[PDB]
Amino acid sequence: EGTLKTTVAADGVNGSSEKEALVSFENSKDGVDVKDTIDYKDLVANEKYNLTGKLMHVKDDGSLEEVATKTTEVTAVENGSGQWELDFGNQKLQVGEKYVVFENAESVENLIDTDNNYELDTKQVVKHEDKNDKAQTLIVEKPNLPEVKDGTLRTTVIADGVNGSSEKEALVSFENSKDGVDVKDTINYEGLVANQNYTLTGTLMHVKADGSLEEIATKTTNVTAGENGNGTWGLDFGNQKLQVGEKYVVFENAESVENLIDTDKDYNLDTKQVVKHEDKNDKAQTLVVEKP
Ligand SMILES: [Ca+2]
Ligand SMILES: [Ca+2]
Ligand SMILES: [Ca+2]
Ligand SMILES: [Ca+2]
């Protein structure tokens, strides 16, 4: 009987029996140009056929859904074996999804005698509808998205050259306070995205005796995460005119300059990585100006 073998071309990449046509993430952005080459054998020489192609979505739920269809009139060459090309044009194919080409060729004329009277009574119908044929299959590649970990910030304030610690606040002597207090902050980060830029906003808070907060200073710098998204940054608030007997604490917020997380499963990055350390009771971030 008559047979069809098929080979899909998706954005210029061909499928084969061992491997599906891979469409790069970059090429999927403007849609995918899909064509199919049909190798026919044992058709009837010089006869016309109606060739119907279908681009099927091999859905994760186990179903096949039609995405495109094209019907055209084609003619079998002398000796009944040759090749036809069917073009689906540009298709908006989904990232991470697999699609397969189905082909059906039906003769325009009756070419088969099914009752042995020499009078032809049935069309020649040949198809290739195999969801497992890798030669007919394409896969739209997924982007390599950043491995976003749970980001953390640990901080240590430095006040007039004295480090804060978890055990004790940075104690600034009265002598040291007389000419203002030089305040800087060490930010130890982990779980950020290597080589990405972040907006680091440090805010020096006055923690009053009632526990209430008041912004004394704020500085905002552009910083880049290091190797493996772990490292150290600094924020220098400069010379601060701090009040004797009062307590101050450093807050830190780091926001990725770009979207680094895909939170709606469409493969497009839509959320920034935000990491903060806003603890009014963390002694490592606290300084106290000592009384005379
Ligand atoms: Ca394309
Ligand atoms: Ca017949
Ligand atoms: Ca000082
Ligand atoms: Ca998204």
mmCIF file of N, CA and C and ligand atoms in Angstrom, residues 11 23-24 26-33 90-91, ligand 1:
data_model
loop_
_atom_site.group_PDB
_atom_site.id
_atom_site.type_symbol
_atom_site.label_atom_id
_atom_site.label_comp_id
_atom_site.label_asym_id
_atom_site.label_seq_id
_atom_site.Cartn_x
_atom_site.Cartn_y
_atom_site.Cartn_z
ATOM 1 N N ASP A 11 11.551 26.821 12.618
ATOM 2 C CA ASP A 11 12.533 27.917 12.569
ATOM 3 C C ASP A 11 13.883 27.419 11.983
ATOM 4 N N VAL A 23 13.534 24.169 19.207
ATOM 5 C CA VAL A 23 13.419 25.602 18.904
ATOM 6 C C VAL A 23 13.980 26.363 20.108
ATOM 7 N N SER A 24 15.042 27.160 19.921
ATOM 8 C CA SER A 24 15.654 27.901 21.034
ATOM 9 C C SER A 24 14.648 28.877 21.646
ATOM 10 N N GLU A 26 15.117 31.983 22.367
ATOM 11 C CA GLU A 26 15.247 33.238 21.596
ATOM 12 C C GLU A 26 14.376 33.238 20.350
ATOM 13 N N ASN A 27 14.434 32.138 19.569
ATOM 14 C CA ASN A 27 13.651 32.015 18.348
ATOM 15 C C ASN A 27 12.149 31.904 18.573
ATOM 16 N N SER A 28 11.703 31.400 19.733
ATOM 17 C CA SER A 28 10.265 31.298 20.022
ATOM 18 C C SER A 28 9.550 32.677 20.202
ATOM 19 N N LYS A 29 10.310 33.745 20.536
ATOM 20 C CA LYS A 29 9.780 35.080 20.869
ATOM 21 C C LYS A 29 8.893 35.705 19.783
ATOM 22 N N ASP A 30 9.243 35.518 18.504
ATOM 23 C CA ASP A 30 8.462 36.066 17.382
ATOM 24 C C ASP A 30 7.592 34.978 16.709
ATOM 25 N N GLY A 31 7.282 33.900 17.434
ATOM 26 C CA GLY A 31 6.547 32.764 16.897
ATOM 27 C C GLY A 31 7.527 31.784 16.270
ATOM 28 N N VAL A 32 7.024 30.623 15.796
ATOM 29 C CA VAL A 32 7.848 29.593 15.141
ATOM 30 C C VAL A 32 7.318 29.339 13.712
ATOM 31 N N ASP A 33 8.206 29.363 12.704
ATOM 32 C CA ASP A 33 7.875 29.087 11.304
ATOM 33 C C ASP A 33 7.909 27.576 11.166
ATOM 34 N N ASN A 90 3.962 31.163 10.320
ATOM 35 C CA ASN A 90 4.274 31.522 11.700
ATOM 36 C C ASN A 90 3.190 31.061 12.687
ATOM 37 N N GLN A 91 3.607 30.335 13.746
ATOM 38 C CA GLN A 91 2.716 29.834 14.804
ATOM 39 C C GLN A 91 3.187 30.310 16.148
HETATM 40 CA CA CA B 1 10.672 32.373 15.440
#
